[PDB]
């Protein structure tokens, strides 16, 4: 995604963003099958999917991904934590 964000070609950006979509969804499935829905790593993949959705111009469900990640990060790891801060930073960047 970061190569796709930092490149000028539209076709290359679309192809690499779709590739990152496949990798993120596969990683999320692996984490969900191994650990479960409510765990830190599943929230990591949710936040990554939210950033990627913000990159693929799909802002509708990027917000859903970001609150989905935050509601698992701040629950298990406490309201104030590093990864909670990183996820709310992504959410704020998506908003503004």
């Amino acid at each position: 995604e970061e190569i796709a964000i930092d490149c000028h070609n539209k076709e290359t950006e679309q192809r690499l963003l779709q590739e990152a979509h496949d990798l993120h969804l596969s990683s999320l499935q692996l984490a969900k099958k191994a650990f479960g829905e409510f765990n830190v790593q599943t929230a990591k993949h949710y936040g990554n999917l939210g950033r990627l959705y913000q990159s693929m111009r799909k802002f509708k469900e990027a917000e859903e991904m970001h609150i989905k990640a935050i509601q698992i990060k701040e629950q298990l790891l406490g309201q104030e934590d590093y990864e909670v801060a990183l996820s709310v930073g992504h959410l704020a960047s998506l908003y503004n």
């Binding site: 995604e1 964000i5 929230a43 936040g47 950033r51 913000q54 990864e83 990183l86 960047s93």
Partner: peptide
């Protein structure tokens, strides 16, 4: 740019 690093 436009966001922070991925978790």
């Amino acid at each position: 740019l436009t966001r922070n690093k991925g978790p």
